[PDB]
Design a protein around this ligand. Sequence first.
Ligand SMILES: [Cl-]
Ligand SMILES: [Li+]
Length: 96
Amino acid sequence: ATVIPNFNTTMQGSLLGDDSRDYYSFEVKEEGEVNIELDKKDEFGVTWTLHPESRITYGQVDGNKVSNKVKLRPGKYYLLVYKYSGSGNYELRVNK
Ligand SMILES: [Cl-]
Ligand SMILES: [Li+]
């Protein structure tokens, strides 16, 4: 996984051709709501799935944005960005 070292900060990714999955992780130190936002930089079928290291959460696809909010306990989390159709690039933010 690519470590996302802080919140409210943009990551760039790419899912062209054979590249169908990108892996991230982040750590929560204080309980609270996170807003995970993917912004498509190309039109294609992309979403994400969050699961804890120790309930899973999915992105909700709203046009160019694929996002959701969830209250997370302290711990490590894994975030899979993956495609289901086509190819393209994206930006990703874990807001808190
Ligand atoms: Cl935190
Ligand atoms: Li990629």
